[PDB]
Design a protein around this ligand. Structure first.
Ligand SMILES: CCCCCCCCCCCCCCCCCC(=O)OC[C@H](COP(=O)([O-])OCC(O)COP(=O)([O-])OC[C@@H](COC(=O)CCCCCCCCCCCCCCCCC)OC(=O)CCCCCCCCCCCCCCCCC)OC(=O)CCCCCCCCCCCCCCCCC
Ligand SMILES: CCCCCCCCCCCCCCCCCC(=O)OC[C@H](COP(=O)([O-])OCC(O)COP(=O)([O-])OC[C@@H](COC(=O)CCCCCCCCCCCCCCCCC)OC(=O)CCCCCCCCCCCCCCCCC)OC(=O)CCCCCCCCCCCCCCCCC
Ligand code: HEA
Ligand code: HEA
Ligand SMILES: CCCCC/C=C/C/C=C/C/C=C/C/C=C\CCCC(=O)O[C@H](COC(=O)CCCCCCCCCCCCCCCCC)COP(=O)(O)OCCN
Ligand SMILES: CCCCC/C=C\C/C=C/C/C=C\C/C=C\CCCC(=O)O[C@H](COC(=O)CCCCCCCCCCCCCCCCC)COP(=O)(O)OCCN
Ligand SMILES: CCCCCC/C=C/CCCCCCCCCC(=O)O[C@H](COC(=O)CCCCCCCCCCCCCCC)COP(=O)(O)OC[C@@H](O)CO
Ligand SMILES: CCCCCC/C=C\CCCCCCCCCC(=O)O[C@H](COC(=O)CCCCCCCCCCCCCCC)COP(=O)(O)OC[C@@H](O)CO
Ligand SMILES: CCCCCCCCCCO[C@@H]1O[C@H](CO)[C@@H](O[C@H]2O[C@H](CO)[C@@H](O)[C@H](O)[C@H]2O)[C@H](O)[C@H]1O
Ligand SMILES: CCCCCCCCCCO[C@@H]1O[C@H](CO)[C@@H](O[C@H]2O[C@H](CO)[C@@H](O)[C@H](O)[C@H]2O)[C@H](O)[C@H]1O
Ligand SMILES: C[C@H](CCC(=O)O)[C@H]1CC[C@H]2[C@@H]3[C@H](O)C[C@@H]4C[C@H](O)CC[C@]4(C)[C@H]3C[C@H](O)[C@]12C
Ligand code: CUA
Ligand SMILES: [Ca+2]
Ligand SMILES: [Cu+2]
Ligand SMILES: [Mg+2]
Lengths: 56, 227, 72, 75, 513, 44, 258, 75, 72
């Protein structure tokens, strides 16, 4: 393998205003949307489960 | 038992409860004095227009602030530990009684000679006889001889309980798989009450202890009648 | 230095592992399982396990792990 | 015999092992006295002491386990 | 921008603000639970008709006040706001991990309120002792949800401890030694070391309880050769350090408040104050079995725990006398914050002294599991922690908000709260000496008068809480913006204005050698 | 981000009466919750 | 700024991590009580996604953006040491449980340790091999460290590969032991102490191995300099912690406890 | 009875504790049997085993020490 | 730093010695000596000692160290 760290330094130092979690490009957006949708949906599901379990 | 508007301990029924009363009086005098001194000194610091706001040297006063409290703690610990080692000293009990905690009642076993055992349940409020005490009476009291050294062994058949009789200075946890020992000696005949003293679920408030202390001859007649 | 720690890796550490592997592989045969006794301090069941039929441990081995009622 | 005396082997609040040791001692002795058809009166001290100290439910459980072959102590 | 700022924060001040809001809400929950306790005990006979529910209310009351009110306010709120400011640091060491310590608390709280809503709740006491807390006597999910609530609270505080220790050690000005950091910063460092060491032992213990309940382990079950008393050792090995965790940041805030309103540049005997907190922290690890004097341990063990426990009075007395010596010679400003701090010194002293009574195992036989213990800890912990929090809140409210309180209203609030807590808790000493057990839904008739008075006191404190909400509303309603504050030369947290900008110490302080 | 008094909080203080509503809902929800949990348990 | 500290970009991962903890705990509850694994699998997924993206971002901030000044690196060193201390005290609670049970065996056990009916593993067979494996891995990881400091890419990768291989070997040996063991977690306090203490240790070996694998791939991608490689140092410290916990388990549970 | 059988308590080359244990067991039994005035015949197994295993000079020394009140084992 | 190690000397180490000195102080005072029993594994004499009468140990205390024939 070859040392491509300089090319990643250039990408992650680009003056584009992106926060570090989104600065790799479109794939970061997709992974963030998957993670947040599973967390928020999972959390809504956990509240439904609480509602169910709160009664006989 | 406790009485209305009571401030202090139930009257001592055993020599070790007497000792604890005297020990508490000693320690409470100290608590009072230290509480009062701190309140007084707050008031003294707050009641002068005189000022001193420059750096103060702390070394000399910190000797007083450590030595005087050290002495006071030693003056508490000495009598404290004397009583602790008295309530450990070897005695010859003449009787062993077991109590087993349950959700929510006590059982008693007197197995020195015969297999005598019985359950002791709280008398419900709706069933109290006139002049009987709410939450404190039981159907079967723990009949014991007065003026004699008794070994109590305490355990549980379910969760933790704790077998307590304040006027005798007694509190011993009831732990399943463990047999805890305490010594009981009443100076007096009569009825002596206590209450379960480890949270054991919904009816923790409702499984009291009642000792019935009688002369040896009457204890023997009661034992004999049980046959 | 790196040279010294490589020398310890190949000259001491891995030879030790080779000798313990040989030791283990010499005593790897199956031991004869002991008679079943339904001791009350073993095969504890206060609540069914959250898998299978509730009565099998997670890495249950039929050859050496009896159930509360004995060997399968 | 009135009750079990102080035993220097078991001097603290936890008397579990005192009960257990005297139950074992009684049953070991009883088995020794039956295994020559000997006499179980020899075992009386251990019997009185475990009967005095041990909870009835412990004695009853241990007895059941000896009969079942599941008693975990050596007799 | 709202989600980025308040859900995705990496800012010590905003995270401190979230902790204060969280703790204030929790305090309302904990106060409502306390009033339900006192409504039941206010008259003999049953009110709720359900003593399992009473036990669930008492259990939840403790968990909410300790884990969701005191610790979030003192360490998450005051700690995050003040520590970086007092050492001229631009943020915490781990500003993103900081945000996760915060966001673990709402889920922790949700698990606690799920415990109370499913089955018949966890009516265990906050100690959660087996076998009552086991799968026979508490079948169903309630205790498991309580254990998981504590795991999330535990992780939140362990990561927060790592953050505070690292921040305080690594992020001071290069010229500033540990012996030039303010006492509040010392108090947080020492609290964080106690958290780091104690919470993992609790985590081990409650994990064992979880496995006994769900995986057929027998750590605490004599049928498998386990021991209920092992749980108590693990719990209290954490629990004694926990009570010092609850008070130490309070000691720090008191030192700053007493110094400030005495018009002093510095507390009396700084190095003795550091020594005293470190001594209390250390001794706090070797005393736990004074919570176990009735379980049947050996006499020599009881003698050791009595003696070790009493030693804590010596460093504690140095702090009390040092606060008094900081007042000495002061130009005293009778601010509401000063009132809270003076109330603290007295009420803390009373509760500490009833602790020394309880340290004597012999007497503890008769006082254990009675209202004497409840009286002790509501003086030293409930009033101590609460009075230090209220003193800190009214002192630093203008720093955090940019707005002033009405000082007359704040004094009224103090007066009501002082009457209420004393009317509530002082009579519980009599109930304890006369043998009323704690954790009781009902009591023999003899105990009626002092329980009646105690319950009347609880309503007085309710009136103070409601007034406190009004006072906070009035400050934000009126918008009196801070102009000047005195003594900034010895209170660095004020020197960037009220409120300080989002980013402070972008250019660090200059401190030479 | 906005800086200064009334701007460093996740709630608005622009209108004291809207603020009174938000603070009432906020503290009142916390205070009410245990009363409703007790009711929920009694109603089983 | 004219300080050397790191002002971190606003991040969603604290909130996703906190919610992952809610889903894993409510998930365990729903598995233990309500016979369902759904919430638990969502929570495990979101936890793994959160850890992946958070630690990715730390690599972006350090290797790619240059935020890890000496002051920042010194902070992370303290952070990792304090984290390891918290993990030592967690293990201490399990050792306390072990010694409590084994030093005072109750009548239910037969008043002996090991309890009646427990046939311990021979500590001189696989447990001794496991000991040689983790001790050897402590030697190979030290070789990796020195190779990196000396600027030797090939030998750092070979030494780190050997370390990971030994970690995997330990894990497969322990999995085999678990299956072959004639006692279970339900075999009273003997099984309880054995499986919970060695099980949490095996979890930490899997975590440590995963950390070393992350370091292996970062090294393959030339992230580490001969002077700046804190992720490698942290993984080495963690790995030494895992070894030391094993040595205490081996002496206590396998050897003294047999 | 031909000789002392294999005893799994004492499976190795050093048989010192086997001799000692059986000597103690014989004398403890003999004491427990003489004391109730029961039958020392129940003690016979321990007697045969210690006589088979124990050097004459050990038994002789231990007997002398029991008579002197200097025997350091518990009987 | 020297300052920190002095703080530990005076704030922890010497207070520890003072507490243990108290503890020792309190538990001193002679305990009664046990009945003499001429155990053959004690009061060993295979060769006379090279001082005194050959029969007294080097730090012989008449109150608590019996000779082979009993207390002096
Ligand atoms: C058991 C569970 C545990 C729960 C614990 C709960 C307690 C802890 C709370 C912790 C704090 C939470 C803050 C997080 C961010 C806020 C999110 C939100 O909902 O925003 C609405 C709300 C702000 O309302 P606003 O005035 O319209 O603000 C508009 C924005 O300025 C302009 O921005 P915008 O226009 O972009 O956005 C505004 C808009 C939309 O904004 C968004 O786009 C954000 C949407 C996502 C936010 C989700 C937040 C989740 C939080 C969960 C709990 C934590 O929001 C709304 O108007 C509607 C949202 C309403 C949601 C309800 C949340 C209220 C808090 C929870 C109450 C408890 C209920 C439990 C019931 C119990 C039953 C058993 O934020 C709050 O939650 C603030 C708290 C309420 C005011 C209290 C004031 C008290 C003052 C006392 C002072 C004491 C401390 C001293 C401080 C020091 C001075 C510096
Ligand atoms: C503002 C908020 C208002 C507060 C809430 C309302 C509190 C209720 C007032 C209680 C009044 C009781 C009463 O009727 O007293 C008559 C009572 C009549 O005397 P007695 O019936 O002959 O009692 C003699 C007993 O033998 C004396 O012996 P004993 O064993 O029967 O009494 C022992 C017991 C009862 O002790 C007492 O005699 C009362 C305690 C004194 C309170 C200060 O004392 C305790 O152990 C209490 C524990 C307190 C822990 C430490 C507290 C530090 C105090 C701070 C000092 C600050 C300086 C000012 O007079 C008193 O001695 C005062 C009480
Ligand atoms: C910090 C801890 C703390 C606090 C503050 C309190 C506060 C109160 N507690 Fe209690 N309590 C405990 C900890 C606490 N408690 C614990 C640990 C138990 C043992 C449980 C068990 O047995 O298992 C217990 C148990 C306990 C009992 C014994 C129950 C029994 O044994 O059956 C009683 C009885 O009256 C009681 C009452 C009260 C009352 C009336 C208040 C309050 O009403 C007193 C007044 C205080 C307030 C009203 C709080 C005000 C603060 C805020 C609102 C925060 C504001 C925030 C900002 C300014 C940012 N509590
Ligand atoms: C803020 C929290 C806090 C603090 C700081 C303390 C401080 C102390 N506590 Fe308390 N304690 C609790 C919270 C706290 N406690 C709680 C929550 C429980 C119950 C848990 C439960 O069961 O639910 C409890 C229970 C508890 C018990 C168990 C009682 C039982 O259950 O039977 C004991 C036993 O010794 C104890 C003692 C002490 C001692 C000696 C101190 C010392 O640190 C106090 C030292 C202070 C002083 C002494 C005052 C100032 C000193 C001077 C002015 C100098 C001069 C003084 C002398 C010479 C004496 N406390
Ligand atoms: C091979 C080396 C390492 C392998 C790791 C384990 C693999 C599966 C599970 C992984 C998680 C393990 C961690 C420790 C938890 C408990 C048990 C784990 C030990 C284990 O694996 O033990 C097994 C049982 O697992 C069981 O019950 C069930 C196990 C699954 C359910 C566990 C759920 C409990 C989770 C507890 C969460 C607590 C988290 C703590 C957070 C603290 C933060 C402050 C043993 O098998 P057995 O058939 O009884 O006997 C073998 C007979 N031939
Ligand atoms: C307070 C602690 C400091 C100890 C100093 C005091 C005493 C002498 C010096 C000790 C040197 C160390 C060890 C030598 C061996 C024995 C002494 C052990 C310590 C001691 O002093 O033991 C005393 C006996 O001393 C006796 O026999 C005394 C016998 C004196 C002669 C010693 C013989 C020397 C042995 C040769 C040394 C060889 C070293 C070789 C080095 C290696 C080279 C390769 C105990 O007194 P007691 O009355 O029996 O019991 C107390 C009853 N109330
Ligand atoms: C199938 C798998 C099942 C198991 C899943 C469970 C979890 C497994 C996770 C394993 C941990 C992976 C951690 C990877 C960390 C990568 C980021 C990293 O290493 O980041 C480094 C910083 O260290 C840092 O933050 C240090 C970060 C330290 C992280 C410490 C992690 C230990 C985590 C333990 C988890 C809790 C366990 C508790 C269980 C009860 C970056 O700095 P450098 O290396 O100097 O580089 C910069 C140079 O290039 C410049 O020249
Ligand atoms: C029953 C199940 C219940 C369990 C619930 C699990 C709880 C929560 C879900 C956990 C999700 C974790 C997600 C990853 C967190 C990584 C944190 C991390 O690595 O934090 C680092 C700091 O901590 C450091 O180093 C050293 C510390 C690293 C710690 C890693 C996380 C450990 C989590 C669990 C451990 C509890 C402890 C076990 C002992 C009790 C980085 O700090 P940041 O502020 O980010 O950046 C700073 C920048 O300068 C970096 O460039
Ligand atoms: C993107 C965000 C994520 C959103 C989350 C999506 C939620 C999915 C809803 C599915 O609900 C499931 O329904 C199953 C069937 O109805 C249940 O099966 C279980 O319950 C059954 C009840 O009949 C039993 O047969 C078994 O225990 C078992 O199959 C199970 O508990 C439950 O989870
Ligand atoms: C317990 C409450 C009050 C305790 C007060 C203890 C304060 C001790 C004051 C010591 O300060 C000194 O006062 C002297 C002048 O008077 C000065 O000359 C001296 O330089 C200064 O250091
Ligand atoms: C050819 C390649 C060069 C790496 C590079 O410099 O880019 C080499 C250098 C070190 C090698 C690794 C090390 O030799 C250790 C391992 C050796 C095994 O036989 C194969 C996998 C193994 C993990 C190797 C894979 C690959 O061949 C690597 C990565
Ligand atoms: Cu039984 Cu409380
Ligand atoms: Ca009532
Ligand atoms: Cu404590
Ligand atoms: Mg108790």
């Amino acid at each position: 393998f070859e040392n491509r760290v300089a090319e990643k330094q250039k990408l992650f130092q680009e003056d584009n205003g992106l926060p570090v979690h989104l600065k790799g490009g479109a794939t970061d957006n997709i992974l963030y949307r998957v993670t947040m949708t599973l967390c928020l949906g999972g959390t809504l599901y956990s509240l439904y489960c609480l509602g169910w379990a709160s009664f006989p | 038992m406790a009485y209305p508007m009571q401030l202090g301990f139930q009257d001592a029924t055993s020599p070790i409860m007497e000792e604890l009363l005297h020990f508490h009086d000693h320690t409470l005098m100290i608590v009072f004095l230290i509480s009062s001194l701190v309140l007084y000194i707050i008031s003294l610091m707050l009641t002068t227009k005189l000022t001193h706001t420059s750096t103060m040297d702390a070394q000399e006063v910190e000797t007083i602030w450590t030595i005087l409290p050290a002495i006071i703690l030693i003056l508490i610990a000495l009598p404290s530990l004397r009583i602790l080692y008295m309530m450990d000293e070897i005695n010859n009990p003449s009787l062993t009684v077991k109590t087993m905690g349950h959700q929510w009642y006590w059982s008693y076993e007197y197995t020195d000679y015969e297999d005598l055992s019985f359950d002791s349940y709280m008398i419900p409020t709706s069933e109290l006889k006139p002049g009987e005490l709410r939450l404190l009476e039981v159907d079967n009291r723990v009949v014991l001889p007065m003026e004699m050294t008794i070994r109590m062994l305490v355990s549980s058949e379910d969760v933790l309980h704790s077998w307590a009789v304040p006027s005798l200075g007694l509190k011993t946890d009831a732990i399943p798989g463990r047999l805890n020992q305490t010594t009981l000696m009443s100076s007096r005949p009569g009825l002596y009450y206590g209450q379960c003293s480890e949270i054991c679920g919904s009816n923790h408030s409702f499984m009291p202890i009642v000792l019935e202390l009688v002369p040896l001859k009457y204890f023997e007649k009661w034992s004999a009648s049980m046959l | 230095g790196a040279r010294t720690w490589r020398f310890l890796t190949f000259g001491l550490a891995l030879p030790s592992v080779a000798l313990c592997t040989l030791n283990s592989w010499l005593h790897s045969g199956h031991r004869e399982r002991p008679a079943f006794i339904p001791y009350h301090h073993l095969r504890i069941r206060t609540k069914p396990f959250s898998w299978g039929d509730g009565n099998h441990t997670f890495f249950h081995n039929p050859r050496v792990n009896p159930l509360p009622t004995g060997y399968e | 015999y009135q009750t079990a005396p102080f035993d220097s082997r078991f001097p603290n609040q936890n008397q579990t092992r005192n009960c257990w040791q005297n139950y074992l001692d009684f049953h070991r002795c009883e088995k020794a006295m039956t295994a020559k058809g000997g006499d179980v009166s020899v075992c009386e001290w251990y019997r009185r002491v475990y009967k005095s100290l041990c909870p009835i439910s412990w004695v009853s459980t241990w007895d059941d386990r000896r009969a079942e072959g599941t008693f975990p102590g050596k007799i | 921008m709202f989600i980025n700022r308040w859900l995705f924060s990496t800012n010590h001040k905003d995270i401190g603000t979230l902790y204060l809001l969280f703790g204030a809400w929790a305090g309302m929950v904990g106060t409502a639970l306390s009033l339900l306790i006192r409504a039941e005990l206010g008259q003999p006979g049953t009110l709720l008709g359900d003593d399992q529910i009473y036990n669930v209310v008492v259990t939840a009351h403790a968990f909410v006040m300790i884990f969701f009110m005191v610790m979030p306010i003192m360490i998450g709120g005051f700690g995050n706001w003040l520590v970086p400011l007092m050492i001229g640091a631009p943020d915490m060491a781990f500003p993103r991990m900081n945000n996760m310590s915060f966001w673990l608390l709402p889920p922790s709280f949700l698990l606690l309120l799920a415990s109370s809503m499913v089955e018949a709740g966890a009516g265990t006491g906050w100690t959660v002792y087996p076998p009552l807390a086991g799968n026979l006597a508490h079948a169903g999910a309630s205790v498991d949800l309580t254990i998981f609530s504590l795991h999330l609270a535990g992780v939140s505080s362990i990561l927060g401890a790592i953050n505070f220790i690292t921040t305080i050690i690594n992020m001071k000005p290069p010229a500033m030694s540990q012996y030039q950091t303010p006492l509040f910063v010392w108090s947080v460092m020492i609290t964080a070391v106690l958290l780091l060491l104690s919470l993992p032992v609790l985590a081990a213990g409650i994990t064992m309880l979880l496995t006994d309940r769900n995986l057929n382990t027998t750590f605490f079950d004599p049928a498998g050769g386990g021991d209920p008393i092992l749980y108590q050792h693990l719990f209290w090995f954490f629990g004694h350090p926990e009570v010092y965790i609850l008070i130490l940041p309070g000691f720090g805030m008191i030192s700053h408040i007493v110094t400030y309103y005495s018009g002093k540049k510095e507390p009396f005997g700084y190095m003795g104050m550091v020594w005293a907190m470190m001594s209390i922290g250390f001794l706090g690890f070797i005393v736990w079995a004074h919570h176990m004097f009735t379980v049947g341990m050996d006499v020599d063990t009881r003698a050791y725990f009595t003696s070790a426990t009493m030693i804590i009075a010596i460093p504690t007395g140095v702090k009390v006398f040092s606060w008094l010596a900081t007042l000495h010679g002061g130009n005293i400003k009778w601010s509401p914050a000063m009132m809270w701090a003076l109330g603290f010194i007295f009420l803390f002293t009373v509760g500490g002294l009833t602790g020394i009574v309880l340290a004597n195992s012999s007497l503890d036989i008769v006082l254990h599991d009675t209202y004497y213990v409840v009286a002790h800890f509501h003086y030293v912990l409930s009033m101590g922690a609460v009075f230090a929090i209220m003193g800190g809140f009214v002192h630093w409210f203008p720093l955090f908000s940019g707005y002033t309180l009405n000082d007359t209203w704040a004094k009224i609030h103090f007066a009501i709260m002082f009457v209420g807590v004393n009317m509530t808790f002082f009579p519980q000493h009599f109930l304890g000496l006369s043998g009323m057990p704690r954790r009781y839904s009902d009591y023999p008739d003899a105990y009626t008068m002092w329980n009646t008075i105690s319950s009347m006191g609880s309503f007085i404190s309710l009136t103070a809480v409601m007034l406190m909400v009004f006072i906070i509303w009035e400050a934000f309603a009126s918008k009196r913006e801070v102009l000047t504050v005195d003594l900034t030369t010895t209170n660095l947290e004020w020197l960037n204005g009220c409120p300080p900008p989002y980013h402070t110490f972008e250019e660090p302080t200059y401190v030479n050698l | 981000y906005e800086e200064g008094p009334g701007k460093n909080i996740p709630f608005s203080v622009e209108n004291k009466w809207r603020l009174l509503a938000m603070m009432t809902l906020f503290f009142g929800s916390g205070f009410a919750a245990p009363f409703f949990i007790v009711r929920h348990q009694l109603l089983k | 700024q004219t300080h050397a500290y790191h002002m971190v970009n606003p991040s969603p991962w604290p909130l996703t991590g906190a919610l992952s903890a809610l889903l894993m705990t409510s998930g365990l509850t729903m598995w233990f009580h309500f016979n369902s694994m759904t919430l638990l699998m969502i929570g495990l997924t979101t936890n793994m996604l959160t850890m992946y993206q958070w630690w990715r971002d730390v690599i972006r901030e350090s290797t790619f953006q240059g935020h890890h000044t000496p002051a920042v690196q010194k902070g992370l060193r303290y952070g990792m040491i304090l984290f390891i201390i918290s993990e030592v005290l967690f293990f201490t609670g399990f050792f306390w449980a072990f010694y409590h049970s084994s030093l005072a065996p109750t009548p239910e056990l037969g008043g002996c340790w090991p309890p009646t009916g427990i046939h311990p593993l021979n500590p001189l067979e696989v447990p001794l091999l496991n000991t040689s494996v983790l001790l050897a891995s402590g030697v190979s990881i030290t070789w990796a460290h020195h190779s990196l400091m000396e600027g030797d890419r090939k030998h750092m990768l070979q030494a780190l590969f050997i370390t990971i291989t030994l970690g995997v070997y330990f894990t497969l040996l322990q999995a085999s032991e678990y299956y072959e063991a004639p006692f279970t977690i339900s075999d009273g306090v003997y099984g309880s102490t054995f499986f919970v203490a060695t099980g949490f240790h095996g979890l930490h070996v899997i975590i440590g191995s995963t950390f070393l694998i992350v370091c292996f791939f970062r090294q393959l991608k030339f992230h580490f300099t001969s002077n700046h490689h804190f992720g490698f140092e942290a993984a080495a410290w963690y790995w030494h912690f895992v070894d030391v916990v094993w040595l205490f388990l081996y002496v206590s549970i396998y050897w003294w406890g047999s």
